[PDB]
Amino acid sequence: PMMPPVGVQASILSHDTIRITWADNSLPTDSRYYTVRWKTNIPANTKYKNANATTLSYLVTGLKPNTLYEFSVMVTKGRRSSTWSMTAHGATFELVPTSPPKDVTVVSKEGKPRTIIVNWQPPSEANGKITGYIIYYSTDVNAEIHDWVIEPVVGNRLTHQIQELTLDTPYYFKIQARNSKGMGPMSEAVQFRTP
Numbered sequence: 547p548m549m550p551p552v553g554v555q556a557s558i559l560s561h562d563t564i565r566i567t568w569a570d571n572s573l574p575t576d577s578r579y580y581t582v583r584w585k586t587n588i589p590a591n592t593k594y595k596n597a598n599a600t601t602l603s604y605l606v607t608g609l610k611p612n613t614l615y616e617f618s619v620m621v622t623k624g625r626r627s628s629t630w631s632m633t634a635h636g637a638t639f640e641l642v643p644t645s646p647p648k649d650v651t652v653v654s655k656e657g658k659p660r661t662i663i664v665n666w667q668p669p670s671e672a673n674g675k676i677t678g679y680i681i682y683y684s685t686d687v688n689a690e691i692h693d694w695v696i697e698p699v700v701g702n703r704l705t706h707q708i709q710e711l712t713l714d715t716p717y718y719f720k721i722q723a724r725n726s727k728g729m730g731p732m733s734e735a736v737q738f739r740t741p
């Protein structure tokens with residue numbers, strides 16, 4: 547039985563890249579190769595992805611942003627092979643949201659016709675901790691973004707009330723998520739006509 551690699555470390559490079567490094571004790575030049583394996587910590591049922599390396603490091607790419615991964619290495623030299631090394635852990639950096647806030651809806655507030663309530667769900671691809679949202683509304687759907695009225699939502703709140711709206715007026719609403727990295731994409735405009 548071959549000696550498994552030691553001193554396994556993870557170096558975070560981006561939202562999709564982690565460098566894995568290790569040491570091989572069976573070295574003081576031959577046909578040996580290392581196999582790096584990784585899977586996300588959660589869900590616990592995740593199948594391992596793996597790659598071969600001929601050096602004492604491997605660049606794990608195509609990872610998901612803001613995700614914790616487990617890494618382990620083994621060595622093979624022909625018919626002989628080792629077990630999996632100690633596990634190294636590494637969580638990719640955050641990235642701007644890459645998806646809009648889901649399930650956007652607008653209702654009129656109970657007994658307040660000039661008041662509306664916006665309701666939504668966090669984006670599917672938040673890619674980090676949501677630091678807020680930005681609501682935009684307009685009487686004209688085709689108006690340039692600066693012409694839309696800005697209504698910021700602080701923190702991961704999933705509701706926001708907008709008061710003093712013109713009656714019997716069709717309004718248009720769209721939202722974008724915000725994280726430590728910036729603004730994500732906008733939702734498709736939802737139309738709502740005030741009573």
Ligand SMILES: *[C@@H]1O[C@H](CO)[C@@H](O)[C@H](O)[C@H]1NC(C)=O
Nearest residue numbers: 579580581596597598599622
């Ligand atoms: C690594 O090399 C071995 C031997 O050539 C092979 O069985 C294995 O499929 C290779 N790894 C990948 C990721 O295909």
